[PDB]
Amino acid sequence: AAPESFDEVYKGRRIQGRPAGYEVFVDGVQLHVMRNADGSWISVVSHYDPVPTPRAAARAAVDELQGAPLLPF
């Protein structure tokens, strides 16, 4: 099974996740994410740093961006 969907405001920004095999959005801009064999996740803006869940990867991306708009991948 893929993780559950999610939707929340984190540090002022909307992060959304949904099964697709999983998609993540930061303020409506899609963020490339990837699942590792052990079940952890990374995104393209934190791609050497595994975190346990896609929400955690979204939150890590918001932390990384420091308010900056994401560019469409």
Binding site: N36, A37, V44, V45, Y48, E64
Partner: protein
Amino acid sequence: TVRKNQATLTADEKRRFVAAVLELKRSGRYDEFVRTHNEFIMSDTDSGERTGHRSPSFLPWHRRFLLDFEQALQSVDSSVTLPYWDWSADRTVRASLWAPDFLGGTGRSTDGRVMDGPFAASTGNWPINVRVDSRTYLRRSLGGSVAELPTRAEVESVLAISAYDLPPYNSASEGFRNHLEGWRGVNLHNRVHVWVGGQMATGVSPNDPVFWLHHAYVDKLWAEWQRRHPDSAYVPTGGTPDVVDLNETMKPWNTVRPADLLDHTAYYTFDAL
């Protein structure tokens, strides 16, 4: 053809390396290395095709990618070679690596912007064009997201692993390649990217020139491993779906195989190995 520890370069060598890197950026060639790398970061997956990362070919793929870049540098200045950063030794922000005459320092706390050295945005000479994070300036937070680089004792534990790689040949593998890459164990290569921060922690990590020096030292560790284990060699050795076997060719070049890249001395030597 000799790759030297960054810490030993002369002032003239530092000057010529910086100038060659800046010319590749000016001419538009540098950014296409950033783009190549991001495409492979985003496509290499543990359950599908994997070539540049999370797979046995991580080491020969980066060896050839670095050779492409060094060749491009030598087209600007034939005296230049890639230096390597031994992060187990040069592990603080006050390494001359991070001096304004070489790569510049850590980023300021507000926005992570690098404010000195030849790659600071203020120079006008290092626009970040290939990007995901929309900002266009080089960023770093040295020691921000992880508080220590690997140590030599950690490196030694990894070099002692005799098997090159093991099934399932991905980020879950035991063996040398995945411990050096860092997805399992004490974590060498991945942790360094996390420690530098800024673009180095992202899929567009070659935006920071320290990328090349980090990978040149990872490449040296592969050479050291080979010396420690003459009886070990690249695996798998044929018929493995989705993974580059020893005698299969690698994208993007299509004309070179891991077998053609195991012996670095065909291309370069180290100052000491």
